[PDB]
Amino acid sequence: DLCFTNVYADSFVIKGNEVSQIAPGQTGNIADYNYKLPDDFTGCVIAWNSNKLDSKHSGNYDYWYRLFRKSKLKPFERDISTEIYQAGNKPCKGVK
Amino acid sequence: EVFNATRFASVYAWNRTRISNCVADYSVLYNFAPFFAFKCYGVSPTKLN
Numbered sequence: 001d002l003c004f005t006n007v008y009a010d011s012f013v014i015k016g017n018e019v020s021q022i023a024p025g026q027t028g029n030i031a032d033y034n035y036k037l038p039d040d041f042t043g044c045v046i047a048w049n050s051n052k053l054d055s056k057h058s059g060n061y062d063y064w065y066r067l068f069r070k071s072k073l074k075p076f077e078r079d080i081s082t083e084i085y086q087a088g089n090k091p092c093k094g095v096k
Numbered sequence: 097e098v099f100n101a102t103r104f105a106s107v108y109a110w111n112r113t114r115i116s117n118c119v120a121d122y123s124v125l126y127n128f129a130p131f132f133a134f135k136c137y138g139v140s141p142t143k144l145n
């Protein structure tokens with residue numbers, strides 16, 4: 001019985017505990033570096049097991065996630081970039 | 097020294113240290129930590145320095 005001026009359907013595959021991670025005002029590697037839901041979130045998330053399409057014999061590694069960002073992620077912002085995280089004071093560009 | 101100990105004791109007998117006469121920069125804290133849980137209550141970790 002509700003009307004929305006717009007609807008955004010953000011989709012991604014994530015681990016089990018990381019579902020409890022995704023919520024308005026949470027913390028952790030995903031809640032801070034990969035997906036930060038805004039505190040005044042008007043919307044809601046959906047999660048169900050997909051062990052048949054994201055799994056196969058010999059394993060699968062197609063998916064990715066970031067644990068090294070220079071700061072926290074502002075809500076609803078993508079940070080797709082491959083830059084080596086600086087540790088200490090040496091750039092060590094090009095090589096891990 | 098606090099984060100590079102070798103024998104962090106058990107929870108039943110928790111090691112207790114004191115920090116005084118310092119300049120406390122937590123960048124070195126962020127360095128030696130593949131963090132899993134930084135839930136901070138009293139202060140905001142971003143606004144900590």
Ligand SMILES: *[C@@H]1O[C@H](CO)[C@@H](O[C@@H]2O[C@H](CO)[C@@H](O)[C@H](O)[C@@H]2O)[C@H](O)[C@H]1NC(C)=O
Nearest residue numbers: 097098100101102103104105110111112113
């Ligand atoms: C908790 O563990 C700390 C690091 O392992 C201890 O700090 C050091 O302890 C050594 C002796 O183990 C001291 O020589 C050194 O100066 C420094 O204080 C700390 O003492 C220890 N505390 C307790 C209550 O066990």
Ligand SMILES: *[C@@H]1O[C@H](CO)[C@@H](O)[C@H](O)[C@H]1NC(C)=O
Nearest residue numbers: 097098099100101127128129
């Ligand atoms: C502890 O200090 C030594 C100093 O050589 C260093 O090699 C080691 O990585 C440090 N370990 C941690 C957990 O900080």
